[PDB]
Amino acid sequence: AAPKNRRSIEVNRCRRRNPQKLIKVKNNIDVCPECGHLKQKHILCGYCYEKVRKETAEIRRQMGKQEGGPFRAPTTETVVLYSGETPSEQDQGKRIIERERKRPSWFTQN
Amino acid sequence: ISHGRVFRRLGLGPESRIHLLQNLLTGLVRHERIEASWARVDELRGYAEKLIDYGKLGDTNERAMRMADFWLTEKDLIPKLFQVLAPRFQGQNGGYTRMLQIPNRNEQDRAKMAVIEYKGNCLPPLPLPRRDSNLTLLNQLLQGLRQDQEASS
Amino acid sequence: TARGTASRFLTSVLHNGLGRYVQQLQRLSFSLSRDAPSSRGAREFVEREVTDFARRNPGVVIYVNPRPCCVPRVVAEYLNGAVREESIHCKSVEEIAALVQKLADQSGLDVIRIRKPFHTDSPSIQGQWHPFTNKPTTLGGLRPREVQ
Amino acid sequence: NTRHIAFSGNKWEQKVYSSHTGYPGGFRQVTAAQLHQKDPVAIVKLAIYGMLPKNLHRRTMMQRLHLFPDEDIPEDILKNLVEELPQPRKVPRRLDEYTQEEIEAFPRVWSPPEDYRL
Amino acid sequence: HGKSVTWWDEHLSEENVPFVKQLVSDENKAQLASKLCPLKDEPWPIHPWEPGSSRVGLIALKLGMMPLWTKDGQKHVVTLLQVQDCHVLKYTPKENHNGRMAALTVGGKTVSHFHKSASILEFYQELGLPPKQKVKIFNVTENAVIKPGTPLYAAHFRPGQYVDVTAKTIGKGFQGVMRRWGFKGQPATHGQTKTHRRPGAISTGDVARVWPGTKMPGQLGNIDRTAFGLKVWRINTKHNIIYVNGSVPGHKNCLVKIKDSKLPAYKDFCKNLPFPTYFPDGDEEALPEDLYDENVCQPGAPSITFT
Amino acid sequence: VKCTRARRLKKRSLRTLWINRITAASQEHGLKYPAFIINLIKCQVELNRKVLADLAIYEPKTFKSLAALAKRRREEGFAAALGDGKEPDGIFSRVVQHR
RNA sequence: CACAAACGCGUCUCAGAGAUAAUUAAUGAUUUAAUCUUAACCUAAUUAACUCAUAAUAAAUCCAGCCCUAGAACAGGGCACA
RNA sequence: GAUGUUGGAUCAGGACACCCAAAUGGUGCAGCCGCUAUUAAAGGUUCGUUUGUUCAACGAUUAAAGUCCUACGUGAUCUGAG
RNA sequence: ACAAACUCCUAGCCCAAUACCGGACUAAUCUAUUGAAACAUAGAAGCAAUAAUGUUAAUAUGAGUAACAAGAAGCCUUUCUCC
C-alpha cells in the first residue's frame, strides 16, 4: 500500500509527541547506603557490585596460579587470606589463597 | 497460547536450550558465582537446585551419577559435586541459591542481567540488600505494639 | 482583508470637535533636492503654494529641507503621537497639493478596518432592553405554578 | 404533560420513526403510536430536535430543553420558572363540559317525529 | 516534591515482618469468627415466602471436575464448586438502584490487606471483615434482604435444583479468525499463497466500507458469560462444596458467581429452599455430611443390579 | 475572492438579522412582522429596518409606541374595509401631502 | 497428547411476557332487515418480525518488584496465612 | 499517463417476485396427497460422478435443496482450469 | 411580508467574459546624459514562472517504519556447545 498524502507536521506531532510514546520518569531511584551513589530500589548498586567484581576476579586469577591445568580443580573447599592472617583449625585442611591486599572493609573474615 | 507452560524457549530449540543450560550449570558448578542473562539465569536456577539434590544421593547411586555425567561437562567437576558441594549442604533442604538482579549490561545491547550463586561458596559476599535496622523510627514504633502484645497476654 | 488586519472602533482623538475643533496635524517635513527631477513637482509646490498653505493653517509647522535626496518625501506627524510617511515622488503641483490637504484633515488615527460607522456613548436613553421589559407582572409576584 | 400529546389525522398510525444500529439488518422502523407507548418523551423531543438549525449549537440547546411526561417537576426546576406560555391550540370540549345554560342556549334545529324511536 | 514509590513491606525489619503478618492474620481469624454468629447479633426481619421472590446468590471457587453417576446408569461430569468466604457486603434499597429490585452486594474469598487501596480498606474497617477478592451484585426482592456483614454457606442450595453460573471465561487472548469465529480456512495444498488462514473477503464491492458488525481477529475469551439450566446434584456440608452439572465457564481455581436460575421453567422453585438464606445457628441441628439428590448413586451403595 | 462575494452577502446578512430583531420585538407586543411593517408604512413613516431594530433594542418605549401606532392603523383598516363606505377616514388613515 | 497445557472426534447449556399481518368471529348504526366497522363503544381469536421483562457489566485514584489458567505492548488478577 | 476480465475458494450484505418452517382464504378440498390465492425475509436452502465450465444430466438425500442484487459482490485474501 | 448583478438612493476612478485582436501602464537589469541614500528622461535587451511524469541542489512524507548482527561462561584467551 502506498500513502496517499504527505502528513502534516501537526499530525506528526500528535503521533510522536503522544504521552504513551514519551519516556516516563522512574521513581524507584535511591541512593547507596555505602557509596552514596544511585541505584534503583530492587537492583544491586553498580559501583559496590564493581568493587566486588574486581576482587572476585583477582581471587580467581590467584587460584588459577595455584592450579596447573585447565582441568585441575580441587576436591576440597577453599578459603582466602589477606596480609597478616593465619588459618584457623576450623579452616585448616582446606585449600588456602594468599593475597597481598589487607582485608577490605566490606568483606568479612568468616 | 502459553497457559501453564513451565519453560521459556531459548536458543535454537529444545535441545539447544538444554545444552545452553549445560554450559550455564557447568560454569555455576565450577566458579560458584556467575552473572548472565536474567531469563537464562532465572531458568537455570531450578536445574542448579535439583543437581544438588542429586549430589545428595551419594557417589554410589547410578542414576544420580550418569545424571551428573550429562549435566556437568568438565568431568573434573563431578567430584566437586559429590565431595564438596553436596556435603556442605545438609541441613538446608532448598536454600542453596542466591539470585539477584545486576544493573543492565553496559554493552550496546543492554540486556537484563542477574547473578546466581551457591550459598556458602568462598567468595566476596554479594552486596545484598539489608532490611532497615530496628532503631528506625517506624520499627521502633512497632516494638511498642510488640511489648504491649506481650504485656496483655 | 478583514480577518487579516487589526480593527478599531470609530473614534475621536481627545474627544476632538466636541468643545472646539482642533486640527490634529502638527508638523510636516518636506525633503527634496533643488537639483533632482524627481522632486520637480514638490519644488514648484514649495515655491508657490507652501507659503499660502502656511497662512491657511497656523497650527501646523512646516520644515522644508533641500538635501541631496533622490526620493522626495513628506512626513506628517500628529498630536496623537502618530506619524505618517509619504512620498511626493514625481507628482504634479496639483497632486501634491491635494495630498497635503489629505494629511491636513486626518485624525492621525491609523487606517484599519473600522468595525462600525457610529460611535455612541449611552445609545440607550429611555432604556436598554432586557428580557422582562415587556412582561406583565402578576399579583404577589408568584411563579407560574406557585401557590400561597 | 408530554404523554398527553395530540396527533392530528391518523398520524398516530402512519408516521414512522426510523433509526439504524449500524449493524447489518440492524435497521428499525417504528410506528409513532408504538414509540410514544414505549417512551412518552421521544415524540416531542424529535419534533424539537428536527426543528432547530443543524449546526452544533442544536446539541447545546438540546440541553436547555426539559421534558416531563406528567406534571412532576423537581422543585428545583419549579422554583426557577419565570412565565407561562399560551397553549398553541384551543382544545375542543367534549359534550359533557358545556353548562346546561349553553346547551339550552343553542337552538333545536329539527323537530323529530314523536312516533320515531331513539 | 519527588515523592517516592512505597509499598508496605519496604522499611520493615526482619523482626517486625512476621509480627505484622501474625498481627494481621490473627485479627482476621478474630474478625471472621466474630460474625460467625449471625442470628444472635441483630438479625434483620425475616419475611415469609412471597411467590414472585428472588433469593440472594453466592460467590464460589471453581475446584475441578469429577464424574458422578445416576441410579439409572448414565454417567455425568459435575463441577466442584467451593464457597470459601461468602459475606454480604452492602445493601442498596430498591429505589436507590434499579427502581425495581433492591441489590445485595456480596464478597469472595479473602486476601491480603497490603495489596489493596485505601478507600476500600476503609470501607472494610467500617464493616469489620477481612478483604474479599471478587465483589458482585445480586438483584433481589425486598423480602430476601439480609443484614450486611453476614456469612453465607453452601447449604444455600439444596440438591436437585437448577442454578446459574457467571464467570470470566478462559482467556485465549488475541486469537485468529478461525478460532475467534469458526471460519473455515482456505485449502492448504492446491496452490494457495499466504492464504491458508485469513478471514477471506470482508465485504461487498458497492458498500465500499465495512460494516460495524463484521467478525474479525481480535481479543477472545476474557469476558463474562453465564450458563443456565445447571442441575445441582450433591452438597458437602462440612467443606461447603456444591456439585453442579456439566461445565461451568472459567478456569479452574477462578472466582465464580452462582445464583438460582431465572429461567422460566424454574421460576417458583424458591418456596422449598432456605429463604432468607440458610442459617447454621437457628435450626440448632446438624445437617448430614452430604445431601444427595434422589437420582444419585452414592459413594457407597448397593452397586446397582438391573432387573 | 471569497472576501469580495462576502462583501456583497454582508448586506443580506445584516438585513436578515435586522428583520428577525424587528420581528422579535413586534412579537413581544403580540404583533407579527408583516402587519407591523406595512401598517407602519401606511402611516407615512419611512423608517429603515436598521434604525427600526435599534429602536427595538435601545428604545423599548418609543418602539412600543410605534407598534401601537401600526396596530391602531391596522384595526382602523379592518374597520375601513369592513365599513364599506367612503365617509370615514380613520384619524391615522388620512394621507397627507408635502408643503 | 514427550510441558503442569491447549484441543475434538468429547462433555455441558439455550428462555417467558407483550405486539401485530393476512384472515376469522360477536354487539351494532348510516339504511330502525341485514351487515366483522376507511362507524363509534367495548370486544374477541389470530405468523414472523420487533419492543420489554429478566439476565450480564457495574466498589474513583497503593502499585517498586515477583508470580499468574491475565496478557502482543499497555492494562487485569494475585504476593497475611501455609 | 490502465475502472486487471469467466468460473470456483473464503466471507457474505441486501431484495421478496417465498423453495422450506409459520398464519390463513378457494377448491373440479370427504381423508391422504394435490392444485391455486393471501400474509410473513428472524433462521435455513445438502453430499457426489462428468464438463474450465455457469447452465445442464445423472447417483443419493432432505423441512427444503428459492428467484435475484451487490463493478454478471469479493484477485492490494486466494485460485487460473478457462 | 421575505427574496437578486435588475432598479432607485449617497458618492464616485461610471458597467462580465474563453480563442484571436487593440490600448495604457509597470518589476528588474544594462547603456547615454542627469542623479547622487534610494534616482528621471531616452536607448537596449538572456526583460518578469503556482503548473512541462520540467533539469540540478536541498529538504520533508512513508518512518524512526521495512530491514539488517555477536554460540556460552570465565582466569581474557582457557574451556565448553554445536555445524
Ligand SMILES: [Mg+2]
Ligand atoms: Mg507462562
Ligand SMILES: [Mg+2]
Ligand atoms: Mg531466540
Ligand SMILES: [Mg+2]
Ligand atoms: Mg519463573
Ligand SMILES: [Mg+2]
Ligand atoms: Mg490467557
Ligand SMILES: [Mg+2]
Ligand atoms: Mg483446512
Ligand SMILES: [Mg+2]
Ligand atoms: Mg503455503
Ligand SMILES: [Mg+2]
Ligand atoms: Mg508467487
Ligand SMILES: [Mg+2]
Ligand atoms: Mg451594490
Ligand SMILES: [Mg+2]
Ligand atoms: Mg339490528
Ligand SMILES: [Mg+2]
Ligand atoms: Mg350479526
Ligand SMILES: [Mg+2]
Ligand atoms: Mg432490555
Ligand SMILES: [Mg+2]
Ligand atoms: Mg492490581
Ligand SMILES: [Mg+2]
Ligand atoms: Mg491516474
Ligand SMILES: [Mg+2]
Ligand atoms: Mg491504478
Ligand SMILES: [Mg+2]
Ligand atoms: Mg446471506
Ligand SMILES: [Mg+2]
Ligand atoms: Mg408479499
